[PDB]
Each structure stands twice: as C-alpha cells, then as structure tokens.
Amino acid sequence: KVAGITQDFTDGTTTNTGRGLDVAISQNGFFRLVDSNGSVFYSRNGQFKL
Amino acid sequence: SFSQAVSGLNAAATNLDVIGNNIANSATYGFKSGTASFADMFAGSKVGLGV
C-alpha cells in the first residue's frame, strides 16, 4: 500500500542570470503573495515584473 | 556547469570591446583610455558561481 508522496526541500543550485528583477533566497524562507481576491500564498520562484 | 562557462564567455567580451574602443580612439586628441576589472561571485555554498 502506497503511503504518501512527500516533497524534498533541499536547496538548489544558485544560477547567475544577469537581468534586473530576480531574487533568490539562500536558506529557508518563502515570499508572501496575495491574489486579487484575498488569499495568501507562499512561493519560491523569483521572477518579477512590473 | 553551463552557467559558469557562459558567464566567462560573457565577461571576456567586454574585455575585448573596451580594447577595440582604445584601438579605434588611439588617434584623437583629448582621449583617456579605459579598462575593466573582474570579481568572482559566491552564493552560500562553497562551489563557485562564475565571474
């Protein structure tokens, strides 16, 4: 019987990109985001634009 | 990986653009030459990141 699927929160490789609005956390953490309805989510992808 | 090689390729191009600029402007009358300087990058880990 398959018990359950679990993630893996090992830190990835930091890779250099060069552009302007991009951030990367180097230890544990998340960014806090809000939808236009009002719920709160937590993310780790750091591609941002205006 | 691929990222360190592509950063080295990208940083060895301004180091030729600023020498081609001096080679071109070595005949004018009020010019001051230029140069570039590099510096390594590092994340939290111990392996390097590029240039």
Curated annotation (Swiss-Prot), chain A:
Q: Where is the signal peptide?
A: none
**Where in the cell does this protein reside?**
Bacterial flagellum basal body
Similarity field? Belongs to the flagella basal body rod proteins family.
User: What's the protein here called?
Assistant: Flagellar hook protein FlgE
Organism expressing this protein natively: Salmonella typhimurium (strain LT2 / SGSC1412 / ATCC 700720)
